[PDB]
Amino acid sequence: EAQPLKFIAVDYCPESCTHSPESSTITLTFDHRGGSRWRSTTRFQYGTFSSLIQCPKGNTSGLNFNIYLSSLEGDKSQDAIDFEFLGKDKRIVQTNYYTAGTGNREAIHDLGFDCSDGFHEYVIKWGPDLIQWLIDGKVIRSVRADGEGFPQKPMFLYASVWDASYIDEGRWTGPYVGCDAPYICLYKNVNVPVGTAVE
């Protein structure tokens, strides 16, 4: 039971987030002023979360564009579940999840397409003992609760575009080249659970 996410908050640089409710589209732009981050206004306790996403065109080296759940962005003891595109390679996506601030569960998935070629569908199914990530209707990763932590705090839905080139000496997302700015990441038909908003 899903519904469109129409009520959002923008955490910084609102001049780089657009929302067109009539087209069910939210855009994030990265350029010399940085990027931006949107989120739901409510947290949720489990459920299915989805969006169509078309990633930015051109040489996206250095950038991270994403969609994720987190209990609170910036909290050092967060729970979170992520899809993160690594801009040096638009034919992969990274998944990860955090439990009381501990991540280190990265996995790299080959998309089979360029994530900027059009809209593709990304889904996170979050339950108390099972998390699944889906791309274009196919499960790409499943994980189960196992005593070494599981995301359980209520979480917001978030998405951002940011320059991650400073992380790990550029090895994670690449150096930021910037030659094709502005970089525009499009989120369409963002859906959140009907019954699980908390509060």
Ligand X SMILES: OC[C@H]1O[C@@H](O[C@H]2[C@H](O)[C@@H](O)[C@H](O[C@H]3[C@H](O)[C@@H](O)[C@H](O[C@H]4[C@H](O)[C@@H](O)[C@@H](O)O[C@@H]4CO)O[C@@H]3CO)O[C@@H]2CO)[C@H](O)[C@@H](O)[C@@H]1O
Ligand Y SMILES: OC[C@H]1O[C@@H](O)[C@H](O)[C@@H](O)[C@@H]1O
Could you give the CA distance from residue 108 to residue 122 in angstroms, rounded to a whole number? 15
Residue 34 engages ligand X in binding (rule: CB under 6 A) = yes
Binding positions for ligand Y, 27-66, rule CB under 6 A: none
Q: Residue 92 and residue 111: Cα distance in Å, rounded? A: 5
Q: Of 80-99, which residues contact ligand Y (CB under 6 A)?
A: 82, 84, 96
167 binds ligand Y (CB under 6 A): yes
Q: Which pair of structure tokens corresponds to residue 87?
A: 């801009």
Name the binder of 167 from ligand Y, ligand X, none, CB < 5-8 A by kind.
ligand Y
C-alpha to C-alpha distance for 169 and 101, rounded to whole angstroms: 22
Scanning residues 106 to 135, which ones bind ligand Y (CB under 6 A)?
Answer: 106
Structure-token pair, residue 78: 């967060």
The partner residues of 110 in beta bridges, in order of sequence, read 92
Element spanning 70, H or E: strand 63-70
Residues that bind ligand X (CB under 6 A): 12-13, 34, 37, 64, 66, 68, 70, 73-74, 80, 82, 84, 98, 158, 160, 162-163
* Residues lying near ligand Y in the complex (CB under 6 A): 82, 84, 96, 103, 106, 167
